[PDB]
Amino acid sequence: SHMDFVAFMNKINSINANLSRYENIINQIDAQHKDLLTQVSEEQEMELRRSLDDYISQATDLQYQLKADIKDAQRDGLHDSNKQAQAENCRQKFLKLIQDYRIIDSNYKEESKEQAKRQYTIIQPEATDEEVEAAINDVNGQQIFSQALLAKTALAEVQARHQELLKLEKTMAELTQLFNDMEELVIE
C-alpha cells in the first residue's frame, strides 16, 4: 500500500543514518591510528587506546545492525523493482565502508608490525633479521619465558603491541566474514 511504502523509506533513511554514522566511526578509528604511531606520552596514549577501544565496539555494533537492517530492506524489495534497487544501493554503500575499514586496519597493522620490530631489536639484540621477522609474525611467538629480565617495565610493551596485532587480525577476519555475509542474496 501507499502507507506500506513510507515505512520502507523510513528503513532507507534509518540505514543511511547509520551508514554516515558508520563512516564517521571508521574515520575516527583511522585518526587514532595516525596518532598512536607517533611518539606520544603514556599520559594520553592509553587515552587514545580508550577512545579506540570504544570506537571498535561501536563499529562492531553498527555492523551487526546494518547487516540486519539492510537484509530486512532486501526481502521487502523481493517483489518491487524500485524497492529492490534502493535496498541494493544501501548494500553497495555498506560493502564500500567495510572495504574502507578493512584497508584502514591493514595499513595500521603493517605499520604496527614495523613499529614492533623496532621495539623488538632492542630487547633481542640478536635474531635480526631472519628471526625477528618470525618473532613478531605468528602468534604465539617468543614472548614465552623471555623473562630472563624481570627499563624493567618497558619489557611488556612489545606484548601490548603483539596482542593488538592479534586484535586487529581478528577484526579483519570479522570484516571478511561480514563482507561475505552481505554478498549472499538472502531469500525469504
Binding site: Q92, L95, K96, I98, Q99, D100, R102, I103, I104, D105, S106, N107, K109, M172, T176, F179, N180, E183
Partner: protein
Amino acid sequence: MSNFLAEQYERDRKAIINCCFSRPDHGEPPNNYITHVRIIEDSKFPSSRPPPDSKLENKKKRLLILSAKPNNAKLIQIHKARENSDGSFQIGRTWQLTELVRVEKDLEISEGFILTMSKKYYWETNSAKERTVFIKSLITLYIQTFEGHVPELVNWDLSLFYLDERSYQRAVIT
C-alpha cells in the same frame, strides 16, 4: 535470451568439479572450486591485443578456474584448462594468486583483459558482462585473501570492487 550463459555456467561448474575438484591425487585432497569463466586466447598473440584480422586458427577455447587449497582458504590458485573431447577438463597451467600484480581492462575491446603474473597474459571472454563478473570475482577474492590489498588496477571502475580513489591508492601493493 541473456540467460543461457547461466545455464552453461552451472553445467561447466559440475563438469569442472567432477573431474578436477572432488577426487584425491597422488596424494593431497583436491582443491576447492570457487568460480570459473570461459576465455579466448590468441596463440600467436598471448600477451597483447591481437590484430582485428586474426583468423580463427589462432584462437583457443580455454577456461580460467579459481580454487583454494583444502587445508588453507588463504592459498588461492589460478588455473587454466581446456575441454577434452571426452567432455571433462584438463588443467594446463596453475598460478598462485600471490603472483597477481596487475589487472588491466581493454578500453577498446569490451571482452579483453590483461592479467600479469610473472608474464603478461591477454585474454578475452565471450561476452562483455562475463569479463565484469569474473574480474570482480578475482579482485574480491584477492582483497579478502591478502589482508585487504589490491593488485595494480588499470582502466577499471573502482566502484565495481567497492573502492574509490583514496582507498585503492591506500591498499595497492605499489
